[PDB]
Subunit: 115 residues, 4 copies
């Protein structure tokens, strides 16, 4: 249950559906290694990215493919993607929700971290 | 200027121009009385609302007519307007989308 | 299920718990009439404000008592409250989620409206 | 100026001052090469990053070191930094909180 991504659309007032998300974890040599990926559901949520055992301490990047999302609607957006980079699990296991709110020339993101 | 409003459009990536803004001060009977108003400029800014002399401590409401703004672009928006209510340099900034806005105060 | 409010805290990375919310509906004479109220739960959600039958077409104001929230933490915030004013159900019944993200000198809000 | 960055602090309601900002351009082999950098001023602004001559079409990354900013205020923040990636007047604005940020592009 440890990592979840939620994406909303501020233009349509809806979940952002079928948004591709890629998660990377920084490796020893400081390269970004592929960690997990998926697509948001009809409710704009992405679950089952990882397990408690696999989501170890480290620096993670969640890249939300906002450009493919807007291009799929028809709209030539500003950003290539929205990145969320963070250290995770560095004082033990936490549950992380990464939420993003998308517009063609703006996005926000926030984290909810619980124990 | 003691009070400035700045309005940006999050969809087009542009200042939000010609947006109506009305400011009210809270009266003793808890009603809102008109204080100042204007339209945003080509840079999405509204200055000249008040002077330091008039802008005393009080509760103020800044109402931004986001609904007319979006309608004129052909978009049905969600909010009737965007209201920012605070007690009192103040900059009230607003970033608009059809179903969302944000607002921040830069008090310098 | 027709009206829900979700509030997050951007300072703590947590749901905003025990935030008071008052909902008003504009009356014939253009006064704001009390409609519903409650407090956000431990997950920062507020459900059971109204029923499909009672939530008729109209203009509604959802006032989120952000100042009492921050004052309860210790922080003297900028805003008195966050207001969300909107016309509801004017092309039939919709389900409305009103979400807000709070910081002492800033908030955002977004609507998710589904059918 | 073709490119300006502006950074605001959503908690204190202030410009975010002395924030490090680094800009990278995407190279042909898909790597990020350094382009320009600076610290935000007392108004939370960074100008002088580039000239029109140098700022050609390309994919750019603006990295804002939000983590050092928050740490210096005694706050453990969530993000390592805030990255804004786009293809190319550009203003990149960022509004910061410890567990949240937003960003917008005002292209005028
Ligand atoms: O919370 C937001 O979405 C947000 C709100 C306002 C701004 C912003 C505020 C300013 F005063 C100037 C600017 F360029 C951008 C940037 C982001
Ligand atoms: O800063 C914002 O605009 C913003 C970003 C995300 C959310 C949000 C996050 C969630 F996990 C759920 C929700 F309903 C809304 C609400 C507002």
């Amino acid at each position: 249950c440890p990592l979840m991504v939620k994406v909303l659309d501020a233009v349509r007032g809806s979940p952002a559906i079928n948004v591709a998300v890629h998660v990377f974890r920084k490796a020893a040599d400081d390269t970004w290694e592929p960690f997990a990926s998926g697509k948001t559901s009809e409710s704009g949520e992405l679950h089952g990215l990882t397990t408690e055992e696999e989501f170890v301490e480290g620096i993670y990047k969640v890249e939300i493919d906002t450009k493919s999302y807007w291009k799929a609607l028809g709209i030539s957006p500003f950003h290539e993607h929205a990145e969320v980079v963070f250290t995770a699990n560095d004082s033990g296991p936490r549950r992380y929700t990464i939420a993003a709110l998308l517009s063609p020339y703006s996005y926000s993101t926030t984290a909810v971290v619980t124990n």
